[PDB]
């Protein structure tokens, strides 16, 4: 207690070193638990990298997915990998950026890149699709803020492409996830979705600064107008953010 | 918003006025500020609820 053993190493020192050993084990546990995705490492050529780091991959853990979606083991065989990427290396070595072969936004390679998620809509606790248009919502309505329905949509370059037809809401958590854009015949056809986190709503109009007017006709569509699958949901969101770098050369080129 | 933001703006203007109004008749800046802050919470909340 108040007396020391082998030198100045008292009980406070013993507790301090005991925590040091525990923390080292904790850091190993914490770091390994983050290796369940994206591992093993690879090089720019796609082969397995010679170096895998100082932390070995953890034991396989299983998630009992709900709504009868089977099980899920994270370490090994990521099903979200995209096969045909439209990129080729700018250098024969490693550590250098890729240059898209074709249209970066259409192919979805850079900031426009999506992930091969499940081709099924996300489900709430009831088993119903999580994101649905507010028209199909039972008793939902705008409670505060500016209602964007009917407001014209202004692209990044200022072009007016159409008016908002509906908002795809998240009835499980009661928030807006998308805005439906009814494209004018000049700027495209059909309807397209833009995520709420990428859109800015003004008093009279609603604007997206990430995508120019000519790129709305190429926004990924949804197979059904009543629900969106995670694959389409990932493609749609990625496309708009891809325009933050690919709408024009001025965004990709250095700003100074 | 709009109405609520404007009502809050009326309160902070009233809070500033009460901050200097009590300073004129004495008090101090910190004592006046507390009444000004208190006024902003009270009349600002009341206006944002009743007017809007």
């Amino acid at each position: 207690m108040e007396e020391t053993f082998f030198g100045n190493f008292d009980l406070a020192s013993l507790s301090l070193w005991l925590f040091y050993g525990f923390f080292a084990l904790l850091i190993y546990y914490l770091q390994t638990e983050n290796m369940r995705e994206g591992y093993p490492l690879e090089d720019d050529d796609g082969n397995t990298a010679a170096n895998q780091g100082p932390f070995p991959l953890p034991k396989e853990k299983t998630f009992k997915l709900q709504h009868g979606r089977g099980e899920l083991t994270l370490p090994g065989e990521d099903v979200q990998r995209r096969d045909n990427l439209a990129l080729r290396k700018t250098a024969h070595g490693n550590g250098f950026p890729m240059e898209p072969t074709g249209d970066p936004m259409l192919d979805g390679v850079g900031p426009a890149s999506w992930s091969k998620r499940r081709d099924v809509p996300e489900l709430d606790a009831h088993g119903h699709p999580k994101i649905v248009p507010m028209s199909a919502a039972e008793g939902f309505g705008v409670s505060a803020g500016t209602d964007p329905r009917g407001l014209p949509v202004m692209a990044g370059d200022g072009e007016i492409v159409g008016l908002v037809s509906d908002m795809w809401i998240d009835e499980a958590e009661q928030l807006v996830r998308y805005l439906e854009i009814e494209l004018d015949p000049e700027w495209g056809d059909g309807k397209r979705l833009v995520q709420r986190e990428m859109v800015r709503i003004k008093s009279d109009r609603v604007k997206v600064r990430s995508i120019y007017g000519k790129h709305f006709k190429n926004v990924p569509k949804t197979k059904s107008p009543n629900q969106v699958t995670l694959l389409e949901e990932d493609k749609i969101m990625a496309y708009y953010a891809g325009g933050t770098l690919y709408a024009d050369e001025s965004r990709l080129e250095p700003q100074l | 918003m709009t109405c609520t933001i404007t009502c809050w703006g009326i309160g902070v203007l009233l809070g500033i006025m009460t901050t200097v109004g009590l300073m004129v008749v004495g008090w101090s800046f910190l004592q006046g500020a507390f009444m000004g802050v208190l006024a902003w919470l009270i009349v600002g909340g009341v206006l944002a609820v009743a007017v809007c």
């Binding site: 998630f63 979200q80 953010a241 770098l245 | 910190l30």
Partner: protein, 274 residues
């Protein structure tokens, strides 16, 4: 190396002042124009710290102490071994921190994600900036910055804390601390929510957002939501960093007296029946 999905995101572009000249990766790190300046400033600042440690006479990490000059030197440059080295390391630290934040802008611009992280880091930079260059200017002496030591800068906090007579009564420190405790409280509960939902007892299905949303509805009667917690949590942490900047920037150049005596306005009001 690269992750299993990193190849696609490694595209050229999204640079502020640099171009393809610095647009490359070194290992996992991304080098840019500001990654070049970060590497230069961080290495120069780190080496000068050990150079000062060599001249200080000790290499013990606990005992290494690079201190600002005397208050008699004012805002001018001091001799290198008399405090001038601390000023240069401060200049290197500001360059390293600003470039690191600007590099993070290049990282997120290349990935198409928002600029929230570099902005959030800039608040922490502002807390350091207000501690080392803003407060000394308001006092007219570089000697008011904290020394660059593991335990020496703890002595500075202790001495500065008691230099205002029971710093606990500082109103901005009172606000800043309760943001620090709430952020840790929010971090624990939010981290627990996701882990609990994702890791149920063995033989039970994983819980979706609805199950974790209703847990605090049954726990504390209101749940801020999956999206709400991240934005309120960022503001909780940024307020903690911002109010920490306030509590130290109002200490010397605003309230030279004791901090309990600041509360004399509450104790002495006309409303109170003395």
């Amino acid at each position: 190396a690269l992750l299993s999905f990193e190849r696609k995101y490694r595209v050229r572009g999204g640079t502020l002042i640099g171009g393809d000249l610095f647009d490359f990766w070194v290992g996992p790190f991304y080098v840019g124009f500001f990654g070049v300046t970060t590497a230069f400033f961080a290495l120069l600042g780190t080496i000068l710290i050990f150079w000062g440690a060599s001249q200080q006479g000790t290499f013990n990490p606990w005992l290494i102490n690079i201190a600002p000059p005397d208050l008699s030197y004012g805002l001018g440059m001091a001799p290198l071994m008399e405090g001038g080295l601390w000023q240069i390391i401060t200049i290197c630290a500001i360059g390293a921190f600003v470039s690191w934040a600007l590099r993070e802008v290049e990282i997120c611009r290349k990935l198409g994600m928002g600029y929230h992280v570099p902005f959030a880091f800039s608040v922490a930079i502002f807390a350091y900036v207000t501690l080392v260059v803003f407060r000394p200017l308001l006092m007219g002496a570089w000697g008011h910055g904290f020394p660059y030591g593991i335990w020496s800068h703890l002595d500075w906090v202790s001495n500065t804390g008691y230099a205002y007579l029971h710093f606990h009564y500082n109103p901005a420190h009172m606000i800043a601390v309760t943001f620090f405790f709430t952020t840790t409280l929010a971090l624990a509960l939010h981290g627990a929510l996701v882990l609990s939902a994702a890791n149920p007892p063995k033989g039970e299905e994983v819980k979706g957002p609805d199950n974790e949303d209703t847990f605090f509805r049954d726990f504390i009667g209101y749940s801020i939501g999956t999206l709400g917690i991240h934005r309120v949590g960022l503001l909780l942490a940024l307020n903690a960093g911002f109010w920490s900047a306030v509590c130290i920037i109002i200490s010397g150049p605003v309230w030279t007296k004791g901090w309990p005596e600041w509360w004399n306005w509450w104790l002495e009001m006309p409303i109170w029946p003395s």
